Amino acid sequence: KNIIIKAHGQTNALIVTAAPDVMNDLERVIAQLDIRRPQVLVEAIIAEVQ
Amino acid sequence: SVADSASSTSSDLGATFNTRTVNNAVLVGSGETVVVGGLLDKTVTDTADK
Numbered sequence: 645k646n647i648i649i650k651a652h653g654q655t656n657a658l659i660v661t662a663a664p665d666v667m668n669d670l671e672r673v674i675a676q677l678d679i680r681r682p683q684v685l686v687e688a689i690i691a692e693v694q
Numbered sequence: 695s696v697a698d699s700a701s702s703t704s705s706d707l708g709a710t711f712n713t714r715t716v717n718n719a720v721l722v723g724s725g726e727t728v729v730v731g732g733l734l735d736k737t738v739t740d741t742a743d744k
Contacts, residue, residue: 683721687732
């Protein structure tokens with residue numbers, strides 16, 4: 645019928661009670677959607693004279 | 695904190711409310727010292743007459 649995705653939030657895990665045959669189209673996409681992310685350090689400087 | 699050595703209170707609301715406010719998001723390893731936020735600044739002024 646449809647794909648019903650439910651997310652827990654209290655263990656930070658999600659379910660998939662949807663098609664029992666093409667779930668592979670979900671494992672691939674979540675695997676491409678869970679990835680460590682790099683972070684950047686920003687510093688700015690200003691100066692003047694009067 | 696609040697200083698109020700001398701400040702602008704016009705018999706209205708007497709307050710300075712010195713503050714520094716940080717917010718961000720970071721990925722960090724378990725046992726690790728981590729630099730989050732930083733500021734360093736000098737300020738000079740001169741007055742001459744002859």
